Amino acid sequence: TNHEQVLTDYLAAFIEELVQAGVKEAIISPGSRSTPLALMMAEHPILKIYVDVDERSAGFFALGLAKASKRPVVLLCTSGTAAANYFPAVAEANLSQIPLIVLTADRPHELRNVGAPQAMDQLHLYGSHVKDFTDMALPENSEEMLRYAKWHGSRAVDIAMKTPRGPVHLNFPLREPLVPILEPSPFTATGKKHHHVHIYYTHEVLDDSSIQKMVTECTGKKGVFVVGPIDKKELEQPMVDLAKKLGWPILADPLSGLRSYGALDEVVIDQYDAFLKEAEILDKLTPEVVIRFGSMPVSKPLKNWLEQLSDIRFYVVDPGAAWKDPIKAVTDMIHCDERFLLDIMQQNMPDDAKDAAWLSRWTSYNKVAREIVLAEMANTTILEEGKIVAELRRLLPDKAGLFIGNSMPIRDVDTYFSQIDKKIKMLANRGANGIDGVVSSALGASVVFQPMFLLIGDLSFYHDMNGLLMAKKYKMNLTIVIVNNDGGGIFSFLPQANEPKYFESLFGTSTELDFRFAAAFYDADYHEAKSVDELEEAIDKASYHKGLDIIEVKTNRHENKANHQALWAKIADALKALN
Amino acid sequence: TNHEQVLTDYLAAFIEELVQAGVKEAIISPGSRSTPLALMMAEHPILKIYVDVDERSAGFFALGLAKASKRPVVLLCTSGTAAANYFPAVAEANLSQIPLIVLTADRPHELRNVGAPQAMDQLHLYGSHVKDFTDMALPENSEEMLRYAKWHGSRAVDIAMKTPRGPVHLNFPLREPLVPILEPSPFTATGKKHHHVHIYYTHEVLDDSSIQKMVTECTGKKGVFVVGPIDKKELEQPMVDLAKKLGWPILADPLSGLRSYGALDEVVIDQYDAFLKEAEILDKLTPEVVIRFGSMPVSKPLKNWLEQLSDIRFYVVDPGAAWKDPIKAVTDMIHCDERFLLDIMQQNMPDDAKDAAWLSRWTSYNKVAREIVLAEMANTTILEEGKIVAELRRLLPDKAGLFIGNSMPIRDVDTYFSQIDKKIKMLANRGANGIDGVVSSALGASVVFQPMFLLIGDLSFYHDMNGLLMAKKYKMNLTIVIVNNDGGGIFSFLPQANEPKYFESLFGTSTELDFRFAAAFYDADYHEAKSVDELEEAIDKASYHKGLDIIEVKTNRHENKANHQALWAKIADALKALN
Amino acid sequence: TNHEQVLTDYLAAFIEELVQAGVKEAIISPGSRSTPLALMMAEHPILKIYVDVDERSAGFFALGLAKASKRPVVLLCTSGTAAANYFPAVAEANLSQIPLIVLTADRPHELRNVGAPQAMDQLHLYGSHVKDFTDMALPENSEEMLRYAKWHGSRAVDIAMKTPRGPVHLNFPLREPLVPILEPSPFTATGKKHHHVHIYYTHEVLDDSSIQKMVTECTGKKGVFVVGPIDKKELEQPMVDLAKKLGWPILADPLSGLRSYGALDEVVIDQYDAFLKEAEILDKLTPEVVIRFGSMPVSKPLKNWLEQLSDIRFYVVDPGAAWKDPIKAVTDMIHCDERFLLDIMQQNMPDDAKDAAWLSRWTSYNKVAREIVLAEMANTTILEEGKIVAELRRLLPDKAGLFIGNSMPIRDVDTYFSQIDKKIKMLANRGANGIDGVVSSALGASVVFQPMFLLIGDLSFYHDMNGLLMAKKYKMNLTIVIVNNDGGGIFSFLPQANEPKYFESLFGTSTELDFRFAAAFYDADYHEAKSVDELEEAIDKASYHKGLDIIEVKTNRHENKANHQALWAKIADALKALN
Ligand SMILES: Cc1ncc(C[n+]2c([C@@H](O)CCC(=O)O)sc(CCOP(=O)(O)OP(=O)(O)O)c2C)c(N)n1
Ligand SMILES: Cc1ncc(C[n+]2c([C@@H](O)CCC(=O)O)sc(CCOP(=O)(O)OP(=O)(O)O)c2C)c(N)n1
Ligand SMILES: Cc1ncc(C[n+]2c([C@@H](O)CCC(=O)O)sc(CCOP(=O)(O)OP(=O)(O)O)c2C)c(N)n1
Ligand SMILES: [Mg+2]
Ligand SMILES: [Mg+2]
Ligand SMILES: [Mg+2]
Ligand SMILES: [Mg+2]
Ligand SMILES: [Mg+2]
Ligand SMILES: [Mg+2]
């Protein structure tokens, strides 16, 4: 009868089901309405909790932790504008297919839409950016209601985790009193037995008729793989193996894993962004079959090349039917597991069909472009942005995670990160390509991969400085390389940089913050790199420090276009006279 | 034919209409998609622009500027997660009825829902938190399309500004190239003439039959006014005048303006939160008529008193039919201008009907409670939270604006800000009562009222430190008093403070940040007050500094409940033996 | 340049893609805005068109045609309230997983939300009841825009057809002039070549670890199959074969196909609704494993039995993760093809594990209940509702389709349709269980199965009489048996039938329509059955008539409960003394 007991039984059934369905970490924000749910998550012995007071930074922290661990992560906040702060992470979880279980407390029906304090319409709050929305019942400890609480915990994880993965949103109207009964413990097998809903491991498969068609239309064709941002693990070697058994180049995004899976290989192309610009070379590269994996790669020239390819079989491997194809060039859509596709083609495609002139065409351009790029970077003392990427490529340990901010860092890794023989798990928020939350994302990922590193421009670092409070609070290890060009450097390349009247105020926002002060605020070892060996020293000192390190490299925004154009011409001119 | 010319003509018609409809300030965030709209806002000679790179802080900066100026303010951001960051300010603009014109650029239809970079579903992005949503056409310079662009500029402002005011959301799909033609100037009467849509000044009025009913049922009744957060200006004196001509007390929220309109008066009650707790006094205070103005006041005891009033005429003056009544006690709903109501009752209610024992009952309790509170604060040297409010009440200039953060600052002003004879415009984000964005809000309001002051707890200050970048960038004057109790002090009062096992991790989040470092980051004069005269010195130094000042006062969270209970008992015991 | 040519190129690319993706039939409603789309669908040589002027009846006609053919069906209507009429069919397509491509024309952006005639907000018109919504671009014949039109045609079908199937909604803003250019033909290979997007056949599969778990936990267990409304064809025999190789009864809904797949068998239970009511028998029937297929069966007693089963492994086979489980009893969720599951268990489960007492328990009750039911019906001359179902079971041809209305027809088929050795495809709108649109649904299904028959109560027949205009217009063959009890007979069973004061006005709405007149209106051969051989004659005459026949059987509403209770007691009393 006690409302506190009814409140306890209800939430205990929901949270226990969540944990047993695979949720191991809950990112909680402080509130009064969320009191019963947050207290019960604490009383769980198996669930790990991270408290973050900024609801925006909390969301991207769950985002990155779920990105890196591949497991479901619970967010929990109070009612009011707190839930609204989750919206940027939710939008990026949706586009980037991350399983977040968004729990938001709310006022009960009597305090809804009546002008009550700290109460807003939380119904369908995130719209189409969640896979499912549920407005839970007011707590009841009835038999059917305890089974309904458990039923929803199982449902929520399963939908979040089901291909294509994405965020899920449960709203909890909660009436006062809000203090549950934590003694005796609501869990710990201290009474009733749970009824966990086991979900079985299922995956999509190509039909045997479709397998034979796929194999037939791809035999002996001059083919090309395009692997953009991918996530499904252990697909690096199988892809390389199938590429070698056909004689096909893989144009590989940095976020594919292929530029850093632990070995060197000939099929991976990492300088396509460099040479797909030169028209006099494009004629010898024309394919007959493209097979895209994962998301669209970062490279704009590659996109414009794929766009203008006529008379071609353009396969797109989209498990879960997300229809991510911004050039709208698809000719054959394959709705099945990527693991399965690589495997049934490895065992069915002919090993004999190999035009060696085809792969030799691609690899030649690449090996030459790659070493002209590594040359100009090896013979420079100016710590320009290309050099930073170069030097991080050399200095990073094996088994090291690298989070990359959007804007210019993500593009420079494309140009200046050729393939290395280290396993370097690479992460980037590439759903909406937002500069918000990259600090909090890299922090959550640092829960999973260590050593963790973050390359990030200055504006994005300011945008999410509050994430660093988590590093201070939880004693996390992250090594942030801030490329401080004082503004938005990416805008110097776009055509708005010609007219200087309204520039700088708009694009390229001079900020003039001494990030030394921000590092003392969050108790971070701060280093400023001026030379090449200055940076070497810092990465080195950062390897002994189990904690937050921040390494600033001041660069000039207005020279970046010149160095990039000068280098691309050296690659274009070389490749232009290469037959 | 030129797409650039078509892009220019379209947006010029829309923005010119906005400016002529009353928009004088545009808060812009940097982006590539928003390039044409942001460039054209720059080429406007009359429109003032503020650039803020944090889209969340940009929104609350528009919120407060529109709060304080009472005029429409444009927000403009690029596509992607940038628009999602506006959502907390939008939610608070909706609940607090602020006219924000939210403009969000987007990719054109071909790049929508196809996996294009930095593109998300921006359709009905903010849901029910906007008054109107519009997905604009792709730019066209046709006659009908130029009139449609102008038609929407006029419509958008008018809906935003129409009672009940609130945010409005226009989405702009924009196809590349995105660089408009700014020379010759698209405005400046350099060609065509505009067709501005004049909107006429309209206001709701009570019918003459309803006037006679209102007057009749309220004559000679033992009545009480409840003015919570109000905004409509120049209603302070008329309310006080009508209260005196009936012999009725006004229970006045700090955000009503009545505790600081420039004069002292007997009808305003500012200690209701103190004495509505003592049951032995409530019997002599029972009213027969309540007339509520504006939002629900902050005070919980007052709410619980109004809730338990049976057999009473509970008028609620809600212009624009927003139905803000969390106790659901309304007996008569009045849908008309508050100015009009005060005026037709001033000229129609009988001057003779006055039971002096009624007002003497209320004013006595108040004058005694008020001076016991000012006594305990005048005779203390510990800069506890009550004292800070006391001392700011004494030290604040006339014609000074005071922004107040949520959580504990807003409640302490209720207890420790009796009425003063200065004009002190008081502001607080009281829609969703969020601790996010209070720094950015106070900053935007500082564009309007000077000198501007901000009282704020520590967590809320950390939550929106990025707002201070605006102060650095635009050289604004703000004097922030941070009440740093290291965590959430408001949670020590709630019943979750008894169980210490899971406290502190959840409620009351120890943060341990030296805000000295955050003040150097944003070039802010920093002062730490330990004594009473230390704070006096700082407010004083802050009055010469045209710039950002930050004044920290460390307080103990775990003593706050004791001082508040000790003081409330002194008021209860006194008032208990007072007849 | 010609807008007519641009309009033609755009829509030709979209419709051709639709046809090549599998759409063979378009159900069009007349309008001015839909003129370009409806004219072009006519100029297609392969697409069959059915015009229906009632937009509500048009939708259920597409519903049933897509239900029976298992293929995608296009709906097309004009702007305004016409699209709103699609909403009931859309809601039922969503719940019942039918692939409908809902195309709704609209006014262009300039005529949107401006008070233009016949224009309403068609954005997200059907909300969460569609799988996907798209607001198409204004027509453009650009390269990218022609590929975008085609891209969306392919996407729309694929999402509709992808498990779990459901409706899809494309909105088309169309600017005047609206007359396309049909000569020379936009299709017929009269110019350009198309680029069809082949989608490959994919299906979910259980992992090999999950297969071994499934097989292990189900070996030798006293198990039971529950097959409610199913649709995936050719699963009747495999299910029966797996049931026989385990010694497990199949509780089979009429809409499963199992009561009429062409043969007789012992594993199918068709009288569970009869005997799951008797408590003294339920103890001997307690299972250890339930494996549910398809939707929830109609039977309420079965649902209440499954609800109260404790300590049991409750498998639910839900391909596409729809989570349809109204008792919330699931213990193991299987997200894979039903075909696959029946097949991997046929080849892995042990043939030896068979407790014959288990199946003998179920089959005995069933064979006895079944023949007591067929006895009482064989020895009656009153054409009560049980008898009608009995006599249709005997008189229906092989290879005959039977559409069943909701309310009381669907329940009587459950009680009075034991298994027969004919192939009788059985259909019912069981998503939202609506009595609207059953005439139009059965009509569309009659496009696929012939001879087609429809059993329907009187109110539902009146609810969708307008569907019969399609039968008149297109010369279709349907034989409607109207069980006219003059009102809602289903309400005499519910507890509201005890209080007669407000009955009849509300539940059980006496209508008093002579349906003879409605049959002349739609040129339908009308027969009224009074005796058993009267009905035999009519079904017989109806078999020579290639056309619309309507056969009324007047029944008494207030006797139905008595006959049903009397019969259920004969079954309960018999089964009570049967060991
Ligand atoms: C929340 C939000 N709001 C605004 C933007 C727009 N936006 C960008 C997109 O164009 C980047 C798309 C991409 O990378 O694909 S980049 C950018 C400046 C970033 O400066 P930085 O971090 O110092 O980096 P660097 O100066 O380039 O070295 C902005 C402001 C955004 N992305 N997200
Ligand atoms: C965005 C968001 N997310 C979470 C909360 C919950 N919430 C509060 C509401 O209960 C305050 C409702 C109110 O004031 O009416 S107060 C609070 C702590 C504030 O600490 P402070 O600023 O240092 O102040 P002090 O410690 O009290 O001196 C939190 C975290 C919120 N309001 N908004
Ligand atoms: C559109 C809509 N609106 C109202 C109803 C409510 N409703 C019913 C549901 O309870 C039937 C749920 C079910 O079958 O599961 S049955 C019913 C009367 C039907 O009378 P009839 O066709 O003459 O049949 P008979 O009298 O039983 O022989 C109504 C009016 C509805 N279903 N759909
Ligand atoms: Mg714990
Ligand atoms: Mg930068
Ligand atoms: Mg200007
Ligand atoms: Mg505080
Ligand atoms: Mg035709
Ligand atoms: Mg009937």
Side-chain angles (χ1 to χ4, degrees), chain B residues 131-189 191 194-341:
Chain B
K131 283 179 90 198
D132 177 62
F133 163 75
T134 298
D135 188 72
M136 298 286 292
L138 279 159
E140 271 165 282
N141 64 346
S142 149
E143 253 156 34
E144 180 161 15
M145 281 329 281
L146 295 185
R147 207 163 29 142
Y148 159 99
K150 183 252 304 155
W151 192 79
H152 273 295
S154 197
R155 197 181 157 267
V157 176
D158 185 50
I159 290 169
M161 283 307 264
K162 186 91 161 18
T163 309
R165 305 198 161 160
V168 154
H169 172 199
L170 280 96
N171 200 65
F172 280 77
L174 292 155
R175 189 181 286 144
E176 283 185 310
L178 292 176
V179 203
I181 318 188
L182 296 193
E183 269 261 45
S185 167
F187 322 92
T188 69
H194 207 234
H195 292 79
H196 163 58
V197 180
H198 185 112
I199 291 114
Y200 293 78
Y201 307 64
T202 60
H203 62 121
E204 336 194 298
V205 152
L206 265 205
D207 261 34
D208 303 272
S209 293
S210 316
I211 289 156
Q212 270 324 120
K213 169 144 189 162
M214 178 75 143
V215 157
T216 315
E217 315 244 38
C218 292
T219 283
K221 316 263 146 224
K222 284 189 320 209
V224 105
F225 291 92
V226 174
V227 189
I230 206 91
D231 42 55
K232 224 207 170 283
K233 337 195 261 184
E234 295 113 278
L235 299 181
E236 286 115 308
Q237 197 65 67
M239 209 138 39
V240 174
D241 290 11
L242 181 48
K244 292 181 160 196
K245 96 161 270 198
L246 316 179
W248 287 11
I250 316 177
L251 319 186
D253 202 72
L255 303 160
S256 63
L258 289 185
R259 305 185 173 196
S260 53
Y261 65 98
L264 296 131
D265 74 68
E266 301 57 21
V267 286
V268 166
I269 305 301
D270 40 44
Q271 308 286 322
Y272 51 86
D273 167 88
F275 60 76
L276 287 174
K277 319 170 103 102
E278 191 26 88
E280 305 187 23
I281 277 76
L282 295 187
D283 324 72
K284 330 167 165 93
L285 295 163
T286 308
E288 318 172 320
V289 163
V290 173
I291 290 152
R292 247 194 67 230
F293 279 94
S295 325
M296 213 47 181
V298 183
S299 181
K300 213 194 76 102
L302 164 64
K303 164 217 102 65
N304 286 103
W305 179 71
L306 290 175
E307 181 162 44
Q308 291 222 252
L309 297 193
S310 147
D311 224 17
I312 164 172
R313 296 293 288 265
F314 205 121
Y315 297 75
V316 171
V317 189
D318 177 17
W323 280 84
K324 295 225 206 275
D325 180 22
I327 29 143
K328 314 139 211 87
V330 47
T331 281
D332 317 68
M333 182 59 83
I334 284 93
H335 286 318
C336 82
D337 216 57
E338 284 132 332
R339 192 65 212 212
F340 180 87
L341 197 65

Side-chain angles (χ1 to χ4, degrees), chain B residues 109 112 165 211 306-307 342 345 421 454 470 491-492 506-507 509:
Chain B
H109 303 76
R112 278 179 173 180
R165 305 198 161 160
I211 289 156
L306 290 175
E307 181 162 44
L342 305 157
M345 290 180 73
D421 40 330
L454 162 54
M470 295 296 272
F491 294 116
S492 320
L506 305 181
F507 328 89
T509 309

Side-chain angles (χ1 to χ4, degrees), chain A residues 124 128 143-144 147-148 150-151 154-156 158-159 162 195-211 213-214 217 306-311 313 315 318 320-336, chain C residues 124 128 143-144 147-148 150-151 154-156 158-159 162 195-211 213-214 217 306-311 313 315 318 320-336:
Chain A
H124 294 287
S128 41
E143 253 156 34
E144 180 161 15
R147 207 163 29 142
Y148 159 99
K150 183 252 304 155
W151 192 79
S154 197
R155 197 181 157 267
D158 185 50
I159 290 169
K162 186 91 161 18
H195 292 79
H196 163 58
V197 180
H198 185 112
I199 291 114
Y200 293 78
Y201 307 64
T202 60
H203 62 121
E204 336 194 298
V205 152
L206 265 205
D207 261 34
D208 303 272
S209 293
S210 316
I211 289 156
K213 169 144 189 162
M214 178 75 143
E217 315 244 38
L306 290 175
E307 181 162 44
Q308 291 222 252
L309 297 193
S310 147
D311 224 17
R313 296 293 288 265
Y315 297 75
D318 177 17
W323 280 84
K324 295 225 206 275
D325 180 22
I327 29 143
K328 314 139 211 87
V330 47
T331 281
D332 317 68
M333 182 59 83
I334 284 93
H335 286 318
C336 82
Chain C
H124 294 288
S128 41
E143 253 156 34
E144 180 161 15
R147 207 163 29 142
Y148 159 99
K150 183 252 304 155
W151 192 79
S154 197
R155 197 181 157 267
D158 185 50
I159 290 169
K162 186 91 161 18
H195 292 79
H196 163 58
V197 180
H198 185 112
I199 291 114
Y200 293 78
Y201 307 64
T202 60
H203 62 121
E204 336 194 298
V205 152
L206 265 205
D207 261 34
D208 303 272
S209 293
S210 316
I211 289 156
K213 169 144 189 162
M214 178 75 143
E217 315 244 38
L306 290 175
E307 181 162 44
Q308 291 222 252
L309 297 193
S310 147
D311 224 17
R313 296 293 288 265
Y315 297 75
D318 177 17
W323 280 84
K324 295 225 206 275
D325 180 22
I327 29 143
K328 314 139 211 87
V330 47
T331 281
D332 317 68
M333 182 59 83
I334 284 93
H335 286 318
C336 82

Side-chain angles (χ1 to χ4, degrees), chain C residues 297-456:
Chain C
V298 183
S299 181
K300 213 194 76 102
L302 164 64
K303 164 217 102 65
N304 286 103
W305 179 71
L306 290 175
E307 181 162 44
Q308 291 222 252
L309 297 193
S310 147
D311 224 17
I312 164 172
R313 296 293 288 265
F314 205 122
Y315 297 75
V316 171
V317 189
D318 177 17
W323 280 84
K324 295 225 206 275
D325 180 22
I327 29 143
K328 314 139 211 87
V330 47
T331 281
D332 317 68
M333 182 59 83
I334 284 93
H335 286 318
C336 82
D337 216 57
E338 284 132 332
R339 192 65 212 212
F340 180 87
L341 197 65
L342 305 157
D343 281 5
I344 62 80
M345 290 180 73
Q346 196 90 235
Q347 258 172 117
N348 280 70
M349 298 272 329
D351 317 342
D352 46 295
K354 232 175 287 291
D355 182 3
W358 180 233
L359 190 49
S360 280
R361 187 95 246 167
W362 287 92
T363 40
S364 297
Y365 291 151
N366 197 46
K367 275 154 156 302
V368 169
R370 165 210 323 251
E371 295 303 328
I372 290 169
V373 161
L374 291 197
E376 286 264 270
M377 287 309 123
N379 290 342
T380 191
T381 38
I382 290 148
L383 264 208
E384 54 147 290
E385 285 148 333
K387 181 67 163 238
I388 315 180
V389 177
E391 279 310 312
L392 263 189
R393 185 176 165 269
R394 159 176 91 88
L395 297 177
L396 268 206
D398 206 11
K399 281 302 298 133
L402 170 66
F403 209 101
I404 314 139
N406 285 292
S407 197
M408 260 318 168
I410 190 45
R411 293 168 174 65
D412 286 347
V413 171
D414 197 2
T415 325
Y416 301 99
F417 204 107
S418 17
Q419 175 184 52
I420 209 88
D421 40 330
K422 324 193 239 196
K423 211 294 198 163
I424 298 190
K425 191 41 184 179
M426 277 189 185
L427 280 97
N429 287 345
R430 272 270 109 178
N433 300 345
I435 69 159
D436 44 338
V438 188
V439 184
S440 308
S441 283
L443 265 162
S446 97
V447 184
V448 174
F449 316 120
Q450 289 287 357
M452 179 70 52
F453 296 72
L454 162 54
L455 179 71
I456 187 171

Side-chain angles (χ1 to χ4, degrees), chain C residues 12-31:
Chain C
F14 179 73
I15 315 160
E16 187 56 79
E17 189 50 62
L18 283 184
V19 168
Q20 285 206 243
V23 177
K24 299 288 150 262
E25 292 108 351
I27 279 74
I28 310 191
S29 282

